[PDB]
Write a protein that binds this DNA or RNA. Sequence first.
DNA 1: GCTAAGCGCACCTAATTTCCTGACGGCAATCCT
Lengths: 368, 375, 373, 169, 165
Amino acid sequence: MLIEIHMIQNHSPANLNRDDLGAPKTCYFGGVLRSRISSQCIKRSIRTSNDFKALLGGVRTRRLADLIQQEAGETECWKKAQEILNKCGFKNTKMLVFMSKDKIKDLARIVLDNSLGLTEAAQQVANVIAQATLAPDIALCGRMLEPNDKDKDKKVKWSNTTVEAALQVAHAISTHIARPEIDYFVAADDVPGEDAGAGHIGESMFASACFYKYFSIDWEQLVKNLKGDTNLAAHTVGAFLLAAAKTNPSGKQNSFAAHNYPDGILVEFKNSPISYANAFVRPVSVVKESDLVEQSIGQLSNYVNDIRLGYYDEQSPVIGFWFSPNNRYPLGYKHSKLASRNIGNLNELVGAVLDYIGGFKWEEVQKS
Amino acid sequence: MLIEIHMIQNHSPANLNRDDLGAPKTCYFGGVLRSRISSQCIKRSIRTSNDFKALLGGVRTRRLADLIQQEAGETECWKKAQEILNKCGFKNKDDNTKMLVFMSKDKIKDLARIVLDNSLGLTEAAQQVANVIAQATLAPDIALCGRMLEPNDKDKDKKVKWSNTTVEAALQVAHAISTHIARPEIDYFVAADDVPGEDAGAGHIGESMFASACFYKYFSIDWEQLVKNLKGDTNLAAHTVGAFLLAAAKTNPSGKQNSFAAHNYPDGILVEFKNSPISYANAFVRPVSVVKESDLVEQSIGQLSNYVNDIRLGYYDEQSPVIGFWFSPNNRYPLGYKHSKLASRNIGNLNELVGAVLDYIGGFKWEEVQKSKAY
Amino acid sequence: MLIEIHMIQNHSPANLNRDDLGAPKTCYFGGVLRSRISSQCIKRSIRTSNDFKALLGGVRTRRLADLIQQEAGETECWKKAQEILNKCGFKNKDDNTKMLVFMSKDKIKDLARIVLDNSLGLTEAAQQVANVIAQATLAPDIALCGRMLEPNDKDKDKKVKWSNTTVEAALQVAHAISTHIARPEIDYFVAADDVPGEDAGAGHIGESMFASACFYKYFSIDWEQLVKNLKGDTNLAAHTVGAFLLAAAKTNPSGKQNSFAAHNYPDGILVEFKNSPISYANAFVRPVSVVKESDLVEQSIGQLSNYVNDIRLGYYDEQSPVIGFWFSPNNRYPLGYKHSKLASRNIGNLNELVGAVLDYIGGFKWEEVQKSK
Amino acid sequence: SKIKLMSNDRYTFADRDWYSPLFSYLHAEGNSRQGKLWLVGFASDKAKSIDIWDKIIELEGTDTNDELLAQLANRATALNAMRKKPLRGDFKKSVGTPQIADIIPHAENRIAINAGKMTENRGYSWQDADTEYGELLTKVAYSLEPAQTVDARLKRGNFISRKPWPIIP
Amino acid sequence: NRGTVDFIASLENLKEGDLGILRKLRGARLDEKLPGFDLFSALWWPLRQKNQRAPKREVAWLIAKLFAEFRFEQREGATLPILMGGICRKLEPKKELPRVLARFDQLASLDIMQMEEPLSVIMGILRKHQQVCLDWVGLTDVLSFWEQEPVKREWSDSFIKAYKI
DNA sequence: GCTAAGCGCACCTAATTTCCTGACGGCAATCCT
């Protein structure tokens, strides 16, 4: 059971993602340049979204000894935590370690602060770190860790740290040809001078594009990662949908306050993942009539009709919900009456997909 | 609590923001050319405005040694201050440091105490100067704009340690995009030689370029972040919000305004209070085409109202309500004709709009928040 | 204090401003084509007007060497003035000094020749020239329109240093935009040869282009910046404001007036005093359409009155009350037929408007401000 | 024998390393002598039998240039250094350009045919043989800079002149 | 090539008022103003009928608007990346030259219906340096042939060889 | 049932300066004992 999210999002002139030289990320698709948003940026923005504070439960840090020492008002233990981590496998203030926050706090306080042996305490810390995989952000993003076998003692064994990712995020590619733009900025000196020159001169780089975003969630793998607590899985799915719809990457948002909301979301329920980016292999050119979101939605609807009239299974019907704010942009403007449940409310969309998932309502699942 | 100000402002033919070549700043918002005003120009115009004069006190300069000498008086010590700054990690090229310093204006006195102190050495005075500079974040404009200060590590004394010199910005300004198809015109200016001479030609021939556009400006103020960056001064935060509203409405960027006196006030201000930042630029994905019986401003507000109603119906119907105030001058341009109940309050005065905003925030009279200023 | 002038002026079919081709200058406002008169055109027409003649101090000339030369002695132009101005940072491209030198006319020209008359050597007399040029600063039109002189540094010797030459402008002029959709029209001209030495040809045949428009003009004067720029001469600032108000109304742009006479006086002038600037150009986002019973000027003034009422009722009604004066020729056009008291005084004469403006500026009568310069 | 399929941080896999056992054999045991040089190389790391290869090199014994044959004795260092140089960048633990690592083998195989003329340096040298990388570099730079622009062409040209600068040990 | 040289000749024979109505039409299409479409029909339709090698509609409209705006004489061997590129030798190589180079670099990533504005700023840079001649015929047959990669390739390395002299 | 010649300009000038950031972060296994 795969939940598929295809979003069309038009953005104001902004620089959400940049490379080494401070340029917007660009990729070649269909032989032409397309503005790109990295999947890791979208995953971070979803994990640090306002619809995720009640659900965020994982920390990916190398400063683990700081976290373990922070739960101690007077019990100064930082060198011994660093030594037990260094013998655990990390070589230094360490490599990056991902696991839960309450787990590291409580369990590391009751394990490594205890005055006891040294090697088996490191084994206990390693078991605590590896087994702490009960966090839905860890369940979605996925994780595996490999410690340095040189600095680790021969008496420390590690269990399976491989968490299979239940979330696949594509890089948001533009539906049209990329338009890289240069912003010539100065920085005026607040005190006067005899020369009247700026304190600094630079060139920022920004681009405005209509991005196609693609997400895929494996329900069976998600409930395998988070174990039998399916209430938390439904809460994770609803929080993901709300965060993906209502959060933008935190790039240069202070200078480019581009917080536009997506004009179209297709949430489809199928056992095979479909990328609709092939709709936009031919770049979208503007015309006198209609706009870019309308043209992109028309191209996407053409490809959706072609895929449903092409790759189709009688044993597994394809079924999906179409989103538009107050039905502003319909999908099948000419003939493609495929979207059965055009939905004009985000909470209604979340309720519908949660009902298709099973006997879950959004208020009932907002308690795990 | 997050305060969003969405302004529709029709400007006269002007060049408010330009690049290195004198061209007006243009962007491609959806495949077509739009006239752009960068957020730095609007931020400077808001910061250096008469309505924002009282909430100043942030200085961003490479000439901090000049300020220290000016505050110290007739005691010289400019080279001593330059030596202290060079040991701190601010390398001087000729007379100014190589990096810009953002600091509170009231703490320069403290710096003049450290530089003029002849008992202390060079490393300890540098450490005290660094401590004062890193702690000088009590100005409202610094709290709005944020800060970064990373000194030169190579030319830094080893016995100099810096604390956290980073404050998060409590203001987000979007680039003002035009609602229609922008197109600039080439002004063929000439310069007149007043002496007759014999050439009877000209003094200079050049190409200015100008544009007229209807701009959509977006401002986002984080209330709790602004309170936190002012360490709990709620009256100061209300003063900043009110003076920011007055500055955003009443002040224009000062780019070639001597030749293009485009001082047009906004034709519509939607002030919304919500938890998450949302923007209505996607209303103008389709460029506004002018019909004979309507107006560019009227159609711009109509399209904005269509998108606002769509977003409110499909995105903003939960247990947490979104309250917006719509301001037009004497209710000249109302909101969407098909609904006529979109805004929670159709305020017809800027001062009344500011009063209603402050009454929503925590309940704040303009008089008792005007009496609390930082300078 | 800011003095603000909004003018409604309907012009005859003419070509007052034109680009290189000769097409009348046009902008797009509100998505529609508008006739445009540029701000520097209005500024130079005001500067070179008969009413502003008494305060016209300044040159802005790239032939300053000849201005130094104008003594009876002819032994200081080709050698002395050219070399000193070259050392100062202005190169010569066939005996003109390239840079335009905006500076005070009478006293600074008089002081520059005593620098250029013998002794004291080079690289020190150039310092005196730079000192007298950067310190000119004292002229009404320089105070209104600002100043620059940033010389080239490559040719200039390192022994000559420059002071701050920037003078802040106290005057902001907007481009005069039309109140309706512009109609560019093509007059087809034929030049006829007087001598019939061949068949009935003409000579030269071509197109001239012209337009007719109702223009909205906007001027802003900063009183304190004007006072600071003239170094505190308050009577000079008041005289400058009064002469600017007279010259903005009584003087038209000097384009093709020999063949297209458009000496049409403004039939609506709104003068307001306020601490912050506004421009009432958003009234004409909707272009004025002429209905049968009325005229274009009346409808333009009605739209202006509607927008002025809306701005005044929607932006400020207390504290600063914004005192405004409305001038029409013999009250031919009232400022709106709706509820009155939009303007504090409906003045039916231009000189009385000047007197009222100067009275609100601080009680300067028109007679003794004329003796300032 | 420096052969391993494992392209590590410090190693770049090119081809049979005929260049490696040349400084010691042409100095101490055998020296310069008219004949054919048969080299057998059994690359190994502990018990890992990696690869066995052999090669035949013609030789006349026309003296011996010391530092040039020493430079030839370790070509893998210069090859790895050329692989590790990134497109644009300064960091040294990066993989550099992995598309170069698939065209170094063909140019090395083309060079290895005239190994005798390389070794004795009659008309073949380091400069004359590393220009055989040119067409592969052009057609890899076409892939890495797939833009028809001025800057892409200039950066392609900078990618063209990349060649293994020799090192002293 | 026939059909293009006569197009350039007819554009050069246009009078001042006709160039003015083309100048006002700059920045938009030709479906909103009559005399722009009448002029495009008059300057295209008979030359389209007379020759099979007439240029494509939108590139011809773009070149017409740009010639009305800038008015440079037609001269052989004066194409864009020679003149600009010889201009690119007299600038400061570290800051100004990369900025003008990026201005010319932008031209390789537009379609035909927004192409006039980056071309306009490039031709404005040309006008600021007193450039009177441009290979208008060369510009329009390389602009109508924009669908291929080799044409942009020879464009680019023509700029390079103009730079390396 | 609907005309036709001839005539369509070129010269002048196109500008100067100065400022252009810093530090931080760069992973490990596992492919013969």
